[PDB]
Design a protein around this nucleic acid. Structure first.
Length: 49
DNA sequence: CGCCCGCTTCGGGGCAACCCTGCGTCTAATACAAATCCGGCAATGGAGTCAAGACCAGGTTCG
């Protein structure tokens, strides 16, 4: 699970303080491409899948 | 009846305060003088050391 892990942070990506609230939610296109369950539950919810 | 002219009202601009869309190897020496380290004898002179050796004073033993 450390492999096959999809993030949105890092270089070339948005910062944590600049993270919009809408990019943390589950779009309905995620069905089959990203898990809507497994994610860190700190101040990183939805930024890492 | 129309007209100027500053007074107020909003716009736009301008500016001040915080993050990363941020985050290269380079002529090459010589010549000389001054300062400084340092290595090694070369005077020590005072401070420690051994040993003899004397100094009685009061237990201790002997008469």
């Amino acid at each position: 699970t450390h492999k096959r892990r999809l993030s949105a942070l890092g270089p070339g990506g948005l910062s944590r303080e600049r993270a919009g609230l809408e990019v943390r939610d589950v779009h309905p296109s995620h069905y089959g491409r990203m898990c809507p369950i497994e994610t860190p539950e700190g101040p990183n919810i939805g930024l890492i899948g």
